[PDB]
Design a protein around this ligand. Structure first.
Ligand code: ADP
Length: 424
């Protein structure tokens, strides 16, 4: 009977998924963000709010009437500043990939060496940059991440975030606190309270129950970031489970009982339930595949590969030099020689070599302290290549399969379900 709504506010549009408690999808949809008015000080946020209302309307009314819990994900370090009394968004949002290099020396002066906040795109750099513009009445402002802000439109209790969204402002999910080096600064007064992802905040506002026909007891739960929501969609929750994304770049995520952070390799941990999600990403993968072969060619050529035979070719497939993970070398050369005359042999070498890099990545995470990988689920454009699944199973020496779901909005709907179950 009861259903669970997840939404995903990504880089270009919004998506939703509604599930039952067994994870069966009852409704799903997508919308591109609409334009915003040039003069609108909310900027993109006005578009995001429009998309929230459009997505809600797109849910069939019979489905809305059963939705018991709502959660949503947004993009990492997309930062809004609001007045606490009026709710007015005080400036155009600082987007996930926007940088505030002006603030970075100040952040490096207060934060531990190589802390994740010490990057110009971090939420903290954005906060410090905004603070230092000396807006009148800045002491009455509050910071919200994109997901927090969209959820606050639904529940009307200002100022709450989650362990994942808050990592890039300096929140420590291991101690479940903001550290003293951050609390010692006056802009810390803008920081939101922080709860676990997928926990209840409060009931859905009456305006939404009245307008859209949600039940009066529908709750709204904290969310997460889009990258983590997409991982959650794989429904893997035990230490040693991993997801490889075979996308334009090769990104791996490993669930661990042990926290792992290493700036040499750009390795970072997020908290998930009572465990740690450990991630790293390589510049190999789909972008170099696409430079060499169309999608149609990859499918056709892969048909000719015998995935149980190893390629003798040692490649490091890259479009240009440089790697951070699993090799920390900004000058690391692409290696695609020798190139055999057979495109099938060439492709086999590339796919096998990317599997070696994937394996090397999981080995590194383990040597840095993570729970050793036991099973690898696969997402991204490369997941549909069953020959490559088999190549990877052989090279990794671990069971490999397709993740059953990979949409962030599906992962957000699992957080809605988590929060409902905890709330009952
Ligand atoms: N059969 C295939 N085998 C391996 N890779 C593939 C295959 N088909 C498409 N791709 C690769 O998938 C990449 C796109 O992956 P995707 O996860 O959809 O993209 P993005 O990272 O941009 O979100 C492309 O670079 C493409 O080369």
């Amino acid at each position: 009977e009861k259903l669970y709504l997840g939404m995903d506010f990504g880089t270009s549009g919004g998506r939703f998924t509604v599930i039952d408690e067994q994870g069966e999808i009852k409704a799903q949809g997508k919308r591109e963000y609409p334009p915003f008015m040039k003069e609108e000080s909310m900027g993109w946020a006005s578009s995001w709010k429009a998309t929230l209302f459009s997505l809600l309307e797109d849910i069939p009314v019979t489905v809305r009437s059963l939705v018991s819990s709502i959660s949503l994900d947004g993009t990492s370090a997309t930062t809004l500043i609001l007045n606490s009394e009026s709710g007015e968004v005080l400036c155009q949002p600082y987007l996930y990939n926007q940088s505030c290099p002006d603030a970075l020396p100040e952040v490096k002066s207060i934060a531990p060496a190589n802390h994740t906040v010490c990057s110009g795109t971090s939420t903290l750099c954005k906060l410090v940059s905004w603070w230092n513009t000396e807006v009148p009445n800045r002491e009455s402002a509050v910071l919200l991440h994109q997901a927090d802000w969209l959820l606050w439109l639904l529940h009307g209790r200002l100022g709450v975030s989650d362990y994942n969204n808050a990592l890039k402002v300096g929140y420590d999910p291991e101690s479940e606190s903001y550290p003293s080096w951050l609390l010692g600064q006056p802009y810390s007064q803008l920081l939101p309270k922080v709860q676990a992802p997928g926990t209840s905040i409060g009931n859905l506002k009456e305006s939404f129950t009245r307008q859209f026909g949600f039940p009066d007891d529908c709750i709204v739960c904290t969310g997460t970031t889009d990258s983590i929501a997409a991982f959650l969609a794989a429904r893997a929750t035990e230490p040693g489970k991993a997801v490889t994304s075979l996308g334009s770049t090769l990104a791996i995520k490993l669930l661990s009982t042990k926290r792992v952070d290493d700036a040499r390799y750009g390795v970072y941990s997020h908290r998930l339930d009572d465990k740690w999600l450990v991630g790293g990403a390589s510049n190999t993968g789909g972008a170099i595949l696409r430079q060499l072969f169309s999608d149609e060619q990859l499918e056709r050529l892969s048909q000719e590969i015998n995935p149980m035979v190893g390629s003798p070719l040692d490649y490091y497939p890259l479009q240009s030099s440089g790697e951070r993970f699993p090799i920390a070398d900004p000058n690391l050369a692409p290696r695609l020689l020798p190139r055999p005359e057979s495109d099938v042999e060439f492709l086999h070498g590339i796919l096998e070599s990317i599997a070696r890099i994937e394996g090397k990545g999981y080995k590194l995470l383990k040597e840095l302290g993570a729970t050793e990988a036991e099973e690898v689920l696969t997402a991204g454009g490369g997941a549909k290549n069953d020959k490559w699944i088999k190549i990877r199973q052989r090279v990794l020496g671990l069971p490999v399969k397709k993740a059953v779901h990979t949409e962030a909005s599906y992962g957000a709907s699992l957080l809605a379900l988590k929060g409902a179950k905890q709330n009952s």
